Structure 1
Amino acid sequence: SRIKTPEDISWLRINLQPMKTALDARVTRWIRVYTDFLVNQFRTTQKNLLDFIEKTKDGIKKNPADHENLHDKKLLMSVMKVISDVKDVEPRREGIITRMKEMVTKLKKHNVPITEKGTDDPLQQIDNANSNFIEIYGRVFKVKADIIPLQAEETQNIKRDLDIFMKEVESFRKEFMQKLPFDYTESMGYENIN
């Protein structure tokens, strides 16, 4: 823009406006390529973690009823889920939220502020998702406190399984060694091998 108006040489008249416009457009393409992806990444990871705390609460709501199958994990629409491991995955999302908030602060320098001024959104979509996240983390914690206690018994079950199966493995390995070097019926060459 600061590039001078069409300057004419002494010999003939001259203009630069098409080049000026095309360079403006080129750097505008640069700006667009930079902006779109950053808005997308920050907003998507925020909506992701919001929904993640949602489904966390919903999962913590299922098991509190004491049953033998609920002593184990849960199975729903091809997804497998323990209570304790989810009590653990909750702080992981809580931790990603902070880096995401810094990223949204950076995004609050191009496009979240274009929203704040242009469309007059009093609350941006990311910050709305963030407030909802706070509420749902609270509710998650409330249901989380009740079913903190979990599968000591099932860990013991795993151990017992490993034991029994190793013992039968050992007996079968002894039989493996017995029948391993052709100590069986040997009538002919193909027979003893087969």
Structure 2
Amino acid sequence: NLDLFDEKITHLKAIQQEISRIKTPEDISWLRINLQPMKTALDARVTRWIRVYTDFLVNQFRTTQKNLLDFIEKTKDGIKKNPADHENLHDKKLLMSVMKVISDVKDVEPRREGIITRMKEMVTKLKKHNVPITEKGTDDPLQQIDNANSNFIEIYGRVFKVKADIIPLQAEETQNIKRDLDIFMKEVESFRKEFMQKSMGYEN
């Protein structure tokens, strides 16, 4: 879970600071031992392990956003009335927005935590000023989408009500054809069961 990761990052960075102190100076035991070339190579392994966790969403933030941007691009198209076909394609974006709007808001909470918990147990800033700007840069579009979508839903409804009339009319036609096909198939499946060979081979 996304709170467990948070806790692991904070523990891993307590582990860094502990490991750094821990190497300790050149300790003498009859012969002199130098741990200076090792201490460095631990810190190298340590940083890589910490990086993965800190870089976990670094990649995903770009790929999420990249996916989040199209949803915006979809909205930027717009237009009211005009061709019926454009709606059919545009309508699906509303159906995906609703399910997203709900499930994304749930997934929005721990993603925000995911940024903050790194900042706490990462002294170094990731992408410098870019990462704080992106959070602000997402929030605005997210709000802009939620306004544009509510405008679309209102228009969507008026016309999809005209479609929801043509859907049933077409649906009744198809359902009637489907039921007829359901019956014919149940006749054909019964025919092969009724027919007993009895000796007879191959033809069965």
When the two structures are superposed, what TM-score results if normalisation uses the length of structure 2?
A: 0.36
* Cα contact 2:26–2:33 (8 A) shared by 1: yes
Taking the aligned partners of 2:106 and 2:172, their CA distance within structure 1 comes to 18
Quote the offset at 1:24 in angstroms. Answer: 0.7
Quote the offset at 1:16 in angstroms. Answer: 2.5
Taking the aligned partners of 1:98 and 1:11, their CA distance within structure 2 comes to 46
Pair 1:94–1:124, CA change in 2 (3 A): same
Q: Which deviates more from structure 2 when the two are superposed, residues 143-152 or residues 126-135?
A: 126-135
Q: Tell me if 1:74 matches 2:93.
A: yes
C-alpha offsets along residues 78-114 of structure 1, whole Å, 9 cap, x if unaligned? 9999999999999999999999999999999999359
C-alpha offsets along residues 111-135 of structure 1, whole Å, 9 cap, x if unaligned? 9359899999999999999999999
Pair 1:26–1:50, CA change in 2 (3 A): same
* Cα contact 1:60–1:144 (8 A) shared by 2: no
* Cα contact 1:7–1:14 (8 A) shared by 2: yes
C-alpha offsets along residues 18-50 of structure 1, whole Å, 9 cap, x if unaligned? 121111111012023323343223432443354
Structure 1, unaligned runs of 5 or more:
180-186
Q: Which deviates more from structure 2 when the two are superposed, residues 24-33 or residues 14-23?
A: 14-23
| Higher RCO by CA contacts (8 Å cutoff, separation 6 or greater) | 2
The size of the alignment, in residue pairs, is 185
Q: Which deviates more from structure 2 when the two are superposed, residues 14-23 or residues 154-163?
A: 154-163
Taking the aligned partners of 1:125 and 1:143, their CA distance within structure 2 comes to 28
- Larger-gyration structure (1/2): 1
Pair 1:118–1:100, CA change in 2 (3 A): closer
Pair 1:116–1:136, CA change in 2 (3 A): farther
Larger helix share, 1 or 2: 2
Pair 1:189–1:91, CA change in 2 (3 A): same
Structure 2, unaligned runs of 5 or more:
1-19
Corresponding residue of 2:53: 34
When the two structures are superposed, what TM-score results if normalisation uses the length of structure 1?
A: 0.37
User: Cα RMSD over matched residues?
Assistant: 10.6
